[PDB]
Amino acid sequence: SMVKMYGNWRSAAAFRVRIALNLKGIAYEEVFLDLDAGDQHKPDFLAINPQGAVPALFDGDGPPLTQSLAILDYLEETRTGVPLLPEEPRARARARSLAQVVACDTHPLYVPRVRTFLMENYGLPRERMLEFLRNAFITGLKTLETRLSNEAGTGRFCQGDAVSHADLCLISLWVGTGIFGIDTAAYPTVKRISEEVLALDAVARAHPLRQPGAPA
Amino acid sequence: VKMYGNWRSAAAFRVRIALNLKGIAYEEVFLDLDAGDQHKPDFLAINPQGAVPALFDGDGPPLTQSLAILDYLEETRTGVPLLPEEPRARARARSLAQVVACDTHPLYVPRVRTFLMENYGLPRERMLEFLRNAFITGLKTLETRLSNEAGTGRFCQGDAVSHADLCLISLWVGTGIFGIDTAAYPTVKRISEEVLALDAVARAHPLRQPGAPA
Ligand SMILES: N[C@@H](CCC(=O)N[C@@H](CS)C(=O)NCC(=O)O)C(=O)O
Numbered sequence A: 001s002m003v004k005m006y007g008n009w010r011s012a013a014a015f016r017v018r019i020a021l022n023l024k025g026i027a028y029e030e031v032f033l034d035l036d037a038g039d040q041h042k043p044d045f046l047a048i049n050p051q052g053a054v055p056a057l058f059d060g061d062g063p064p065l066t067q068s069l070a071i072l073d074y075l076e077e078t079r080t081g082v083p084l085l086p087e088e089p090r091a092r093a094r095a096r097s098l099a100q101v102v103a104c105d106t107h108p109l110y111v112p113r114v115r116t117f118l119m120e121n122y123g124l125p126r127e128r129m130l131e132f133l134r135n136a137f138i139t140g141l142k143t144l145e146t147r148l149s150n151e152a153g154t155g156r157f158c159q160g161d162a163v164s165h166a167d168l169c170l171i172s173l174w175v176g177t178g179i180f181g182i183d184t185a186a187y188p189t190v191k192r193i194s195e196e197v198l199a200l201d202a203v204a205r206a207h208p209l210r211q212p213g214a215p216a
Numbered sequence B: 001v002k003m004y005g006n007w008r009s010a011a012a013f014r015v016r017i018a019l020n021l022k023g024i025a026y027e028e029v030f031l032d033l034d035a036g037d038q039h040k041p042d043f044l045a046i047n048p049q050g051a052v053p054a055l056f057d058g059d060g061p062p063l064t065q066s067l068a069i070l071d072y073l074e075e076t077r078t079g080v081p082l083l084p085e086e087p088r089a090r091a092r093a094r095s096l097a098q099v100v101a102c103d104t105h106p107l108y109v110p111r112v113r114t115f116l117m118e119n120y121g122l123p124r125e126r127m128l129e130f131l132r133n134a135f136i137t138g139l140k141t142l143e144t145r146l147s148n149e150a151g152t153g154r155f156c157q158g159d160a161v162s163h164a165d166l167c168l169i170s171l172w173v174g175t176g177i178f179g180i181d182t183a184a185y186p187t188v189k190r191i192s193e194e195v196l197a198l199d200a201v202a203r204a205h206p207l208r209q210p211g212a213p214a
């Protein structure tokens, strides 16, 4: 009947997909796992995604899809009304590169399994573990600020004047700066674009703090 | 086409494979990532991330990020397809690729190894536990997915090489380099050997690049 997503309130990866579903007007239901209580490690969920991570997405008949970027492209290829990539190949590649600075080189360094491994494997206290998370955030934010401020492709959004996968990934990082307490004063271009993105109904409705399980 | 690369780099290897498979000539400029060439101002002007690959295609600005580059080559060049036609199949191929390119590889690159040693004072051998765990986690995920999902054929997705296989082999060759036991991943091994048997892949292999050991 309708698209079904396995997600979590806090997850940046689920947030990216949630935004795309809203932007494209796709009706969906979301099942919220508790990733801190280990719902992602239960046999029932491992049957859906052996990786033990969210998001996982069902689109009618067929196996579930995982990995937020792959899912964003799937939605692009199967629901074309509101495109979230430009048409020109260099512009597409830049948007994807910016997206991947976040989705490959930043976010995977601060997910719960990394945070717990640092504590459990090395005996690091949470406070010292967070130095790794902060370094990942700051490294990604500095990269994005430099690229967005200096490259000709930036407009109202990351790439030109249309929302793209880059912006979905950027806002997913930005909301994390709030959640994890990263100072963002040094990234004014990232701030400008993130606030432009967050002003959209489709994005705001998808915000982690509006999902079940969120704190006040 | 001009690529800033490195002999050992898994991400550069992904792109190098695609260039060879598609019949795209390239110049590769080999950075020394132990010497910190990637942190030099001239290179940071090319890629503020201080990472490889970075690719120039004619006169435009450089392109970074191996997956973004793979899609760029798909979209702007002819040569053998490395993605299927049907969206569910494309999504699966990309998801398997991203298990490696997003969730595994970024955890074992030099910058992370260095941060672990310098920030926490971890001995090299203790730091390597982080690298080993990342490999094993990714290999376990790939073995389970590839062994149980109907989409797997001769290759990761069906019977044609795709982005999934380029990322998979980029991880596989790391198992030898970092001494990861692979006995538990026979499906990954089977596919990796099918992939390595392709001359284009074999030519691109890290251990066959200038800068690699004798
Ligand atoms: N690269 C993956 C990220 C998958 C991932 O690790 N997601 C996190 C939440 S944002 C997760 O569910 N982690 C579970 C865990 O660490 O145990 C994607 O884009 O979907």
Ligand SMILES: N[C@@H](CCC(=O)N[C@@H](CS)C(=O)NCC(=O)O)C(=O)O
Pocket: A100, A104, A105, B008, B009, B010, B011, B012, B033, B038, B050, B051, B052, B053, B064, B065, B066, B067, B101, B106, B109, B110, B111, B112
């Ligand atoms: N997600 C990026 C990864 C880029 C990356 O981390 N490259 C490594 C080599 S495989 C690098 O240059 N690292 C520099 C460093 O760690 O200092 C991609 O797919 O291109």
